[PDB]
Amino acid sequence: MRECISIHVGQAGVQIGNACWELYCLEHGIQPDGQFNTFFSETGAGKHVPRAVFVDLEPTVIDEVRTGTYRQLFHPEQLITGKEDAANNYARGHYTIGKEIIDLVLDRIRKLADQCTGLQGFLVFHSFGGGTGSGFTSLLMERLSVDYGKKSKLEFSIYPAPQVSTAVVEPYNSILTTHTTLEHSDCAFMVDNEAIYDICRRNLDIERPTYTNLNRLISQIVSSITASLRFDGALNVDLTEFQTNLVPYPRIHFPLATYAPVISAEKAYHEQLSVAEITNACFEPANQMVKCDPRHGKYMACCLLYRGDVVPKDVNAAIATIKTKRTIQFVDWCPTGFKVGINYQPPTVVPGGDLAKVQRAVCMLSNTTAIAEAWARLDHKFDLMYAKRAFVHWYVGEGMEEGEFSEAREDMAALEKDYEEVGV
Amino acid sequence: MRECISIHVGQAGVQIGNACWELYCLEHGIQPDGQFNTFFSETGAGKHVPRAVFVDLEPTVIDEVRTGTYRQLFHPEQLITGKEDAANNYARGHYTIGKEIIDLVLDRIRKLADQCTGLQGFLVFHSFGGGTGSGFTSLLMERLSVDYGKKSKLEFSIYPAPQVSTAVVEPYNSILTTHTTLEHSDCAFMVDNEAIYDICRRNLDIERPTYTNLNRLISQIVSSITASLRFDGALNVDLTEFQTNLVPYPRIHFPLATYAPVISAEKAYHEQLSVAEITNACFEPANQMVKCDPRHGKYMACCLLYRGDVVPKDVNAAIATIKTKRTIQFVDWCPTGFKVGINYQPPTVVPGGDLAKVQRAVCMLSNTTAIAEAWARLDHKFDLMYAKRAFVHWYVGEGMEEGEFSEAREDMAALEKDYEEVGV
Amino acid sequence: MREIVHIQAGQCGNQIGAKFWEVISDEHGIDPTGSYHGDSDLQLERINVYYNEAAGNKYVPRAILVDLEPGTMDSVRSGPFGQIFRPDNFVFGQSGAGNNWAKGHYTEGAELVDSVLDVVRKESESCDCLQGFQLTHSLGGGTGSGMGTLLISKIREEYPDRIMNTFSVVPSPKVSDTVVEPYNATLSVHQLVENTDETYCIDNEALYDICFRTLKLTTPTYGDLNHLVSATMSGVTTCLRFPGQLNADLRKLAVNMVPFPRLHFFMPGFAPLTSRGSQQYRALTVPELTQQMFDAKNMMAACDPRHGRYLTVAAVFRGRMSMKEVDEQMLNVQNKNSSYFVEWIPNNVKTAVCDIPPRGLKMSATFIGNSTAIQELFKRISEQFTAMFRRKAFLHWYTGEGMDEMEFTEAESNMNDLVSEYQQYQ
Amino acid sequence: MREIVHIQAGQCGNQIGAKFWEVISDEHGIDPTGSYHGDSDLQLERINVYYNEAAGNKYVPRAILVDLEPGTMDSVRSGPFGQIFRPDNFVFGQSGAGNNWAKGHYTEGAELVDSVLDVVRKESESCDCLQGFQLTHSLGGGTGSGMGTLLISKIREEYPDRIMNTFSVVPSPKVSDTVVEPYNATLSVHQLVENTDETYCIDNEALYDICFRTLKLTTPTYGDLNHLVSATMSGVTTCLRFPGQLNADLRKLAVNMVPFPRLHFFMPGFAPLTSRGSQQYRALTVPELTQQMFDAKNMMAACDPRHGRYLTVAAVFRGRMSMKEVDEQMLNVQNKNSSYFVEWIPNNVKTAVCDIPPRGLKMSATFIGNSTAIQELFKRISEQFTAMFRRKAFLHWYTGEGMDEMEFTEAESNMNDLVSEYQQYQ
Numbered sequence A, B: 001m002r003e004c005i006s007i008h009v010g011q012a013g014v015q016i017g018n019a020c021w022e023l024y025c026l027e028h029g030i031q032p033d034g035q036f037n038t039f040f041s042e043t044g045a046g047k048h049v050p051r052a053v054f055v056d057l058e059p060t061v062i063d064e065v066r067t068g069t070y071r072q073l074f075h076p077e078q079l080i081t082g083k084e085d086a087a088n089n090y091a092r093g094h095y096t097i098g099k100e101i102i103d104l105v106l107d108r109i110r111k112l113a114d115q116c117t118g119l120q121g122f123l124v125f126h127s128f129g130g131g132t133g134s135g136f137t138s139l140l141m142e143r144l145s146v147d148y149g150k151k152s153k154l155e156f157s158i159y160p161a162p163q164v165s166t167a168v169v170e171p172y173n174s175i176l177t178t179h180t181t182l183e184h185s186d187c188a189f190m191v192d193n194e195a196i197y198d199i200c201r202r203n204l205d206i207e208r209p210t211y212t213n214l215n216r217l218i219s220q221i222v223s224s225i226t227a228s229l230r231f232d233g234a235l236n237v238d239l240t241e242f243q244t245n246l247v248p249y250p251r252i253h254f255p256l257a258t259y260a261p262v263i264s265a266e267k268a269y270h271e272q273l274s275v276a277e278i279t280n281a282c283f284e285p286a287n288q289m290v291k292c293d294p295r296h297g298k299y300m301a302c303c304l305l306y307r308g309d310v311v312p313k314d315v316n317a318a319i320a321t322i323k324t325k326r327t328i329q330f331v332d333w334c335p336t337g338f339k340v341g342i343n344y345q346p347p348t349v350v351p352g353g354d355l356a357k358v359q360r361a362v363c364m365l366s367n368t369t370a371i372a373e374a375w376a377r378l379d380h381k382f383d384l385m386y387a388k389r390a391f392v393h394w395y396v397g398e399g400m401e402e403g404e405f406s407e408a409r410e411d412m413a414a415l416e417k418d419y420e421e422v423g424v
Numbered sequence C, D: 001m002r003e004i005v006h007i008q009a010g011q012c013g014n015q016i017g018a019k020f021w022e023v024i025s026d027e028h029g030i031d032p033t034g035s036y037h038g039d040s041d042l043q044l045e046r047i048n049v050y051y052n053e054a055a056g057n058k059y060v061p062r063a064i065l066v067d068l069e070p071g072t073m074d075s076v077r078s079g080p081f082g083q084i085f086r087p088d089n090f091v092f093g094q095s096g097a098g099n100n101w102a103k104g105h106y107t108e109g110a111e112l113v114d115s116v117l118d119v120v121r122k123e124s125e126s127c128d129c130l131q132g133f134q135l136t137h138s139l140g141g142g143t144g145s146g147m148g149t150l151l152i153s154k155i156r157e158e159y160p161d162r163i164m165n166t167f168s169v170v171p172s173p174k175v176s177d178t179v180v181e182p183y184n185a186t187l188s189v190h191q192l193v194e195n196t197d198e199t200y201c202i203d204n205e206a207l208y209d210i211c212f213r214t215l216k217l218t219t220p221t222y223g224d225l226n227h228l229v230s231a232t233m234s235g236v237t238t239c240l241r242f243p244g245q246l247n248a249d250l251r252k253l254a255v256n257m258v259p260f261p262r263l264h265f266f267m268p269g270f271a272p273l274t275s276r277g278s279q280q281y282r283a284l285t286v287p288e289l290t291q292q293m294f295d296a297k298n299m300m301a302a303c304d305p306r307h308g309r310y311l312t313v314a315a316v317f318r319g320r321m322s323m324k325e326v327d328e329q330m331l332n333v334q335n336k337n338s339s340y341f342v343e344w345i346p347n348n349v350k351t352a353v354c355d356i357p358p359r360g361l362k363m364s365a366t367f368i369g370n371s372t373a374i375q376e377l378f379k380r381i382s383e384q385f386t387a388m389f390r391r392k393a394f395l396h397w398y399t400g401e402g403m404d405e406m407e408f409t410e411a412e413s414n415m416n417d418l419v420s421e422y423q424q425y426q
């Protein structure tokens, strides 16, 4: 049967993973003590065990998981630990400390694969900017590529925001990650914290958020992406289809991920929440989950994942309407720029949560030239930093070389050029 | 009926034997006061008495046994004693002090044989490196060979580890034992303490072990080896079959002994513990119960002893998978390199123990060219020691001669050469 | 005599197939457990056309269910009539097709196809006189399109003198359901041009139009659309399964509907289709039925039939009716509107009639049109394809499976030739 | 008339034998205590073929149970039908055979064989007209292989004009069960080539394939595999025990299946074998049964029958059926696929039919094929053996029992000659 393996790497990734697992449990009625095959590997005592890899170089987040509510759910191995974190240092992830743990991780992955009779591939959770999530993740991905080749390697990545950050070596790390996951990862789905905060401010009418809320939101999106593997419905999408439909050229593979309706209990009753409306919301500039205007960019390819009550006719109508709008610009070379997925199973509400129950929800994954601007900004930042050789002694002092940075910059430039070409 | 006699020699051997007997009692419901024929000789009062020979030159371990819990179980003769131990001196075992006790031991063995209507042979427990377990055991074995000839003489031996030891005349003794049990013992099964410790660290997640645990582990293996004599099942293996299947040439007769799954209560629930998985674990380099990499050596012959719930089809599949792997290298001249044994009776849990209850367990006995490296290392150690004539006055002062050592070294060299030849 | 073997491939193919088997089952009085509970001997007389009989008066459809992923077929089995199928006739792989024709046709599908062929052979061996094969699939995906085409190729090679007909769900001009649809469709169509005897072209947009404009249905389900398709499908083979005044046949229809070998793409229609509100308001006359049949709004393809000419149309009527009336109606249509019928083929309309009407209706009809308007669909697909291919957009997914540029160009060439041919008779 | 004496040797031989005696007992309506509880007079008419009658209407199988170790036979006695056997017909030694042909044939077995021969003589003296002997054993071990072969030698010397047939479990190409298997098998096979009239070659891998691919059985037990083997065994002697339209016999089968004296190694099969899930889905027709019979997937040896030619095949049908149909089916197979049948023997298929079908089935069939493909098994064994022998690996265990190198070379020579002979007709 259809089976996939999750990998959660870092602090952020692990946090996201916790939320995801909670959501999954809520969906499939599994208790916190383990009392589906797609995600939960079943054993001979009416016990369901997640099929995930949990990795951190700092033993803190993992320790929390091990002590908390869902400790009996997880295996005592899936949760892997180290001794000291990378500390926002790609070099300490990719070269120095990662090559101590990576083997174990690989072994675990192999074991998990062995336990499956049709592994669709991988879902990986990391962060552009973090020390572990940048370098270690990259290393892992390379190894996976070497091993499996034609198994799906999907990534969920926390992109650094333009006007806000939490680390002053974040441009370097991200750039390095981009350089060394450009020839491995098939899809890298993007979420941005600033964007999420903006969404919270606007749609939810909440202006005192925290990381937990963000994680929950991310988990919803993840669930939507993966809902076709675990339930019936017209147009059952696969993990392998995304690659086919959202990657026109192999270097160009960063699509944005957005969710609608993200709305509180008060204006759920006021709104109709029809299909068309939701679709419209999905394409609105402010509702997007990154800091980019899709008015400044042409949509190459979009993928829509309707979940709940949806008459396909209505969906079609909505799509037609979207096409009609002047705006919402598409590229010349992609007329058919839509993929549609439908599930009978509705979204699931998490107790003590932000979101209310809905009849129908939609998740949109869109690959566009709007991200080019973001990339350019990042490059500029990098240039500003690297011109004075700031922080370079840390990276060079653990493995890296002067020249690698230059190469990375060149690669970024090439990517930008490609994007520009696509735009024409 | 099928009957075998155990012999336990030394301190270590005696310790192992205690554990073994406990395990046996647990299996067959025999109380500590004696209230099966294969191991327990039955008398005319509903009383079951072990069919073993317990020998020590130091009266301490034996005394402990005589005072402890299972004192009423054992006969007041089977437990034999001396006055002073060899003190890590092969010469005081084989020549000086052993020829005082050996006759009595022989008599006891004869008596035991007389009480059987189909003696399959002997199981002997000693230690390469110890004073008694080296020399005395060798002496005993020679005598047995002289007497019985075509009765099975299986040995269970504690091989000295490479990077750790507990005696600084251990190379000599072991070498001597090897020299004088090369033309007598049919099989000499091997366990190494360092390896066991490593296993405990890795699989069990326990890093405060003791000798008792090790003994228990050894006993499990022993039980697995001997389970076919005492229970029903498809593919009932005999003590005589091992010799046939694991000894391609008469000098080459040291196979490694490994057990799976050796796992605690916490990750017994996480793991599926299927047959194939267990088989895979059995062939893994780290899981082996000696300090050798089987990647640096070709498997001549392997023997697998599945115990519990096993569909033979599954076992076959597992074996096929193993064969497929590039990696696990076999010799050119042995294509059929597998022997399979199955029992309906599962493993038995010992109260206050390390291991949890399992559905199915596997014991693997493998004869490989990986042990050649170990032998070479031992030889090197010996050479380093003997070059200065260190400790030789102790051995020469009780019987031995300068020249015997040289002969032993030559023999070892020959063995190494044979191994090399086999490798080609 | 006249056994038909059914193959259903991919998600859409299996889904439509499930509905089709339901409909046929109800027509023959077969319950989901394979028991007969009919009232007429006509129900069993030709049951062998679609069903195979087993011990205990059990009937098992001669259906082969194929997919590269297990989900859809698991759902089918879970479904109402799912237990009626032979378990050994579910043939599936483990890895998906990713909406990728190359995976269906050359790589993943290539690994599975031999197993399917073996089952097919087994079924054909049980036929006293096998008429041919019916396939159900989509053109825009990977499995139905790539794998399905592959199967067709294999079977035509092995059974070149049997009928090979497909019900093929095609992409719709407004609202595409996948991004690589043009590529997949073109790759499939290329193969179908040369390896099928007839293909019924179904457009989901047209079905939605039917549901909304005609049936007045606020909330159509894919199930409901599937039902309509199944009804059309059943219509085609009615004359094999029941008596009549003019007993049609697949081969007969082909003979009358295909004037040149490559022009075998038909627009299907069904009548009557009337809203549940306005049922008593309609008088169910053969003339009115005819009018419905010929109405563009009652077609199931993405064409305006008025933007082309009919080369030939086959009408199959079900129920009691006057042959006089039918013929007169046919004459009237052609005389009145001779411009919409190619002038070089006198009597462009063929009629067949089967006495036994479908459940709940006194009269019904199924329409099959070979119109030069179909060229518009092909032209639009070609435009789309070229828009992508000239930039080699999405192409690495296909070259990575061993396909070359030259194949795509060949496909384009075929398409254009087909369009040119259609334009000739326009 | 036509008494058959059964000998079961070693672990596998005794285990298979237990199952066989169960099956035969149920067929004849004999309960484990030797009491008859049947409904038909046909059940007792020829009961003497396998059973001996004792005081109080007790029936005791003419079975001799042999092993060098007591365990397996103790288990058998403990078993369900174990109490049905004559206690005096358990003949056992005390020391094991260590998977060592030399111990079975020359040393340990030599000490026991006279005792077995005495029992055999005693049984043969109770036969009005003894047809022959049936042996069950494995080829890869020590007891069944070495001891079993020895017994065969002795009995053929004493009863050279009786039938000697064996059901011999052979090693499987993928997953060997012992390390010295090639040596033991070669040593046995050498003797069987010259001392048996027919040998049914059973491969456990093929049985597992049957269980998994055909029967859809997730978790087959050795018991279940044994059952299948027992069913095949019963098939062979059906025509001695029951009436029919074409009454077969062991000797008749031999006559039709062995065109040259040394080529007497058969691939057995059984039909129908259908999953418990898909029982109502199958129509139980003679044609379909025939197809099952001839399907390589339904064979019990480690061969691809399509990689050789059939010299002769014997089919034994059980139940009610049309002889016309049977003959026609046989003709169709040969005409259609004449390349798979040796051209120098017209009418390569022989058919027998017995009216009384096995329990729970209306029809069944047993297939016995003499195919040149069997050479592959022998060739593979020879390769393995040579791989070891050229390095004298494991040889000291055999030389220590008095065997010489020359015997091994002789065995190899025989094997190669056999292979060459098979290749002639290939």
Ligand SMILES: CC[C@H](/C=C(/C)[C@@H]1C[C@@H](OC)C[C@H](O)C(C)(C)[C@@]2(O)O[C@@H](C[C@@H](OC)[C@H](O)C(=O)O1)C[C@@H](OC)[C@H]2O)CO
Binding pocket: C117, C118, C119, C121, C122, C125, D290, D291, D294, D295, D296, D297, D305, D306, D333, D337, D340
């Ligand atoms: C005649 C002797 C004989 C040789 C042949 C080739 C025979 C003939 C036919 O059987 C009688 C085949 C048969 O008519 C079928 C096609 C229905 C079918 O059964 O063929 C097999 C594969 C075929 O080998 C290709 C088979 O294994 C086999 O043995 O076939 C797949 C199977 O899937 C359901 C089905 O498709 C060997 O004993």
Ligand SMILES: Nc1nc2c(ncn2[C@@H]2O[C@H](COP(=O)(O)OP(=O)(O)OP(=O)(O)O)[C@@H](O)[C@H]2O)c(=O)[nH]1
Binding pocket: A009, A010, A011, A012, A013, A015, A016, A057, A085, A086, A087, A088, A089, A127, A128, A129, A130, A131, A132, A133, A134, A158, A160, A166, A193, A211, A214, A215
């Ligand atoms: N959405 C979300 N973002 C997070 C979370 N935790 C960290 N981040 C973001 O991730 C980035 C920091 O990377 P971390 O994952 O914390 O770093 P790490 O992977 O543990 O690497 P080191 O700590 O450097 O070894 C920042 O952009 C944070 O805002 C979380 O729980 N949710």
Ligand SMILES: Nc1nc2c(ncn2[C@@H]2O[C@H](COP(=O)(O)OP(=O)(O)OP(=O)(O)O)[C@@H](O)[C@H]2O)c(=O)[nH]1
Binding pocket: B009, B010, B011, B012, B013, B015, B016, B057, B085, B086, B087, B088, B089, B127, B128, B129, B130, B131, B132, B133, B134, B158, B160, B166, B193, B211, B214, B215
């Ligand atoms: N596994 C295990 N090893 C033991 C045990 N006791 C001793 N050993 C090992 O055996 C070796 C020492 O030999 P002993 O058996 O103690 O010596 P002995 O046979 O009594 O000989 P002497 O004391 O020299 O007369 C060392 O390698 C120990 O680690 C035990 O209970 N279990």
Ligand SMILES: Nc1nc2c(ncn2[C@@H]2O[C@H](COP(=O)(O)OP(=O)(O)O)[C@@H](O)[C@H]2O)c(=O)[nH]1
Binding pocket: A234, A235, C009, C010, C011, C012, C013, C015, C016, C097, C099, C137, C138, C140, C141, C142, C143, C144, C145, C169, C170, C171, C177, C204, C222, C225, C226
């Ligand atoms: N009419 C109809 N169309 C369907 C159905 N399921 C999928 N589709 C259509 O089929 C196309 C997608 O192909 P699909 O069969 O799901 O992909 P595949 O499994 O790779 O062949 C799209 O045009 C969908 O609108 C269905 O049940 N009915």
Ligand SMILES: Nc1nc2c(ncn2[C@@H]2O[C@H](COP(=O)(O)OP(=O)(O)O)[C@@H](O)[C@H]2O)c(=O)[nH]1
Binding pocket: B234, B235, D009, D010, D011, D012, D013, D015, D016, D097, D099, D137, D138, D140, D141, D142, D143, D144, D145, D169, D170, D171, D177, D204, D222, D225, D226
């Ligand atoms: N089919 C089947 N094979 C068996 C059985 N028992 C053992 N075997 C097979 O017989 C061979 C081992 O020989 P065995 O009869 O146990 O040795 P023996 O007692 O020395 O003759 C192997 O190939 C086993 O797989 C059984 O009950 N059924």
Ligand SMILES: [Mg+2]
Binding pocket: A010, A011, A056, A058, A085, A132
């Ligand atoms: Mg961290």
Ligand SMILES: [Mg+2]
Binding pocket: B010, B011, B056, B058, B085, B132
């Ligand atoms: Mg001591």
